[PDB]
Design a protein around this ligand. Structure first.
Ligand SMILES: CN(C)c1ccc(C(=O)NCCCCCCC(=O)NO)cc1
Ligand SMILES: [Yb+3]
Ligand SMILES: [Zn+2]
Length: 607
């Protein structure tokens, strides 16, 4: 049972298919139409069922041509309102019916952000995009909003004819809208069963450019050129992933580069990965986010977490798989560099939450907690650490990659728990039980804090970052003169990023140090979003007032939560910036993504 869903669970009935027909109305900021769910009974004498909804207006519910009775429960906060539907005939086990629900979303749907023309690149057209993971699909349409159920889907989306709709599906044609010649209808088919958190929709002035045999990059016109460059490794990454995980089953792999307020680095919507434009560094150095999303086509989209309590299964294995893709592209020493960095990030999260915090457990209990509130690097990096540890315990990456491929084949098209994974692990490594049985499973899976064992990391590419960081940390005033732009000559962009992360762990530094750093390195001029984020955190935590406008601007000119939340928090913790941070949030909040608006408010202890 899925503590985050209010719907009938899979033991009662399962949605097999969705046919969505909707119209996007930028005036009223609503999606309007019909969600026809083919539902299979899993019980004898099934007479009613419950769906998830969130701020939906239900117009009617039709089964075999007739309106049927339904009622909406009391809103249960971020869970929304359960909707009980009375079936007109009782269903036997395995019997399937179609339930046609007419509905309209609210302008305040937590799944959606509606952008005015001035919020887009082009300035002439508005824009809409969705983000359903974890539990926002219910705010677009009535569903069993739980990853324990997988369905296929078809859709027809009516939009102003000057715009383009895309979804997490194969494009199946466009036509003028028969009802309305100022409109176009775009068609979509997803033949592979998916959890409903993978439903996605974007509408805007989108253009496309081919960048691989099964990849087009979509964006507003202003970003297409840089995007085609930035993500040019996509096909080579997909070929590697296929080698590691088995056949890519989804057909197309397109990319969509969103406007700056998209809340996440990437989202692995099937057939159409959504990415932040803050990936656009000019040198492909942030493309590991693409390798990550690619990897979810196996770990998460094919084999899926049964409830959000088991999110690590999705994220940890994806980080594991993407670090392999990076290692295949650039070398094992690079794989180690990224893994060791990911340990640093785990250390950071644990210090931030605190070493006893229940959300520092690998497997968590989400009863009564908004998954967006509890979201952090933990399931990613503690998840990965477990896997990298097991890799080294069981005889190395080649051996563990056989397990990973077999694990994907075994649970393709299914939704599973941590016990399913662990059971299969023991099964595959039957001949190595004695080694597995030395693992402290209770602490790894269920204890808070850092894991009980640290894996072994190659240091080769990290040493230079550490050395330059330790020079700055151990420097006194009369050593500042010895730093010079030549210090960076031999560092890659990743190493620069890792130098900054090492240094930021020891923040604050003295203000004269941070001043000298800008004097000699000009970090203010770097466009790399990761590097600039860490440089700006270091400056604010080290109380440099000059950085305040830069950090405010970065927090607001884009909205990827990974950057926007810590920057607003740092700025709120700095007495010289506190009020301006609060007021800037208060000024921007109407125009932010609803989820990011919400969390930034909590983080700032405002309203
Ligand atoms: C266990 N727990 C506390 C949570 C579980 C799931 C989420 C979630 O799905 N959040 C939405 C994630 C969207 C994508 C993040 C970037 C990513 O991994 N892309 O692949 C949140 C918290
Ligand atoms: Yb019966
Ligand atoms: Zn992910």
């Amino acid at each position: 049972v899925d503590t985050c869903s209010l719907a009938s669970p899979a033991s009662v009935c399962r949605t097999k298919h969705l046919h969505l027909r909707c119209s996007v109305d930028f005036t009223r900021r609503t999606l309007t139409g019909t969600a026809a769910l083919t539902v299979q009974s899993q019980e004898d004498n099934l007479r009613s069922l419950v769906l998830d909804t969130k701020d939906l207006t239900i117009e009617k519910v039709v089964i075999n041509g007739q309106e049927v009775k339904y009622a909406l429960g009391e809103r249960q906060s971020y869970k929304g309102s359960p909707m009980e539907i009375s079936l007109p005939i009782a269903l036997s086990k395995n019997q399937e019916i179609v339930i046609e629900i007419s509905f309209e979303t609210s302008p305040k749907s937590s799944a959606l952000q509606w952008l005015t023309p001035e919020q887009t690149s082009g300035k002439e057209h508005p824009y809409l995009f969705s983000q359903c993971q974890a539990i926002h699909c219910r705010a677009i349409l009535p569903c069993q909003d739980t990853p324990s159920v997988k369905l296929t889907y078809t859709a027809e989306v009516s939009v102003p004819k000057e715009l383009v709709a895309l979804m997490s599906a194969i494009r199946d044609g466009e036509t003028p809208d028969p009802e309305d010649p100022s409109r176009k209808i775009y068609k979509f088919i997803q033949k592979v069963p998916i959890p409903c958190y993978l439903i996605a929709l974007v509408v805007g002035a989108l253009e496309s450019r081919q960048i691989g045999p099964r990849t087009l990059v979509w964006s507003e016109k202003e970003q297409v050129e840089k995007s085609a460059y930035e993500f040019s490794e996509t096909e080579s990454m997909l070929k590697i992933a296929e080698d590691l995980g088995g056949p890519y089953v989804w057909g197309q792999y397109d990319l969509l580069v969103l406007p700056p307020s998209f809340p996440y680095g990437g989202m692995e919507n099937p057939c159409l990965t959504f990415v932040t434009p803050t990936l656009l560094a000019g040198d492909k150095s942030l493309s590991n986010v693409i390798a990550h999303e690619i990897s979810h086509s196996w770990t998460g989209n094919l084999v899926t977490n049964k409830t959000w309590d088991h999110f690590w299964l999705n994220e940890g294995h994806t980080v594991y798989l993407e670090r392999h893709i990076c290692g295949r592209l650039f070398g094992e020493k690079f794989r180690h560099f990224n893994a060791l960095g990911g340990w640093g990030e785990l250390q950071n999260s644990v210090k931030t939450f605190g070493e006893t915090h229940p959300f520092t457990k690998l497997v968590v209990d989400l009863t009564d907690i908004d998954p967006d509130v509890a979201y952090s690097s933990v399931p990613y990096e503690k998840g990965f650490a477990l896997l990298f540890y097991l890799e080294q315990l069981l005889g190395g990456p080649e051996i563990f990659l056989g397990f990973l491929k077999a694990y994907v084949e075994k649970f393709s098209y299914k939704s599973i728990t941590t016990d399913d994974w662990k059971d299969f692990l023991y099964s595959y490594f039957k001949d190595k039980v004695d080694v597995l049985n030395q693992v402290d499973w209770n602490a790894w899976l269920y204890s808070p804090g850092l894991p009980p064992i640290k894996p072994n990391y190659d240091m080769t590419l990290t040493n230079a970052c550490i050395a330059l960081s330790q020079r700055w940390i151990t420097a006194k005033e009369d050593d500042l003169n010895s730093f010079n732009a030549t210090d960076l000559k031999d560092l890659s962009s990743h190493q620069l990023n890792e130098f900054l992360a090492q240094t930021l762990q020891r923040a604050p530094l003295p203000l004269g140090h941070i001043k000298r750093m800008q004097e000699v390195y000009n970090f203010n001029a770097i466009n790399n979003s990761e590097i600039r984020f860490r440089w700006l955190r270091l400056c604010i935590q080290s109380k440099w007032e000059d950085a305040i406008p830069l950090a405010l601007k970065m927090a607001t000119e884009q909205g990827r939560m990974k950057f926007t939340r810590p920057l607003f928090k740092d700025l709120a913790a700095f007495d010289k910036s506190h009020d301006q941070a609060v007021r800037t949030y208060q000024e921007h909040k109407a125009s932010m993504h609803p989820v990011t608006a919400m969390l930034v408010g909590k983080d700032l202890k405002v309203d």
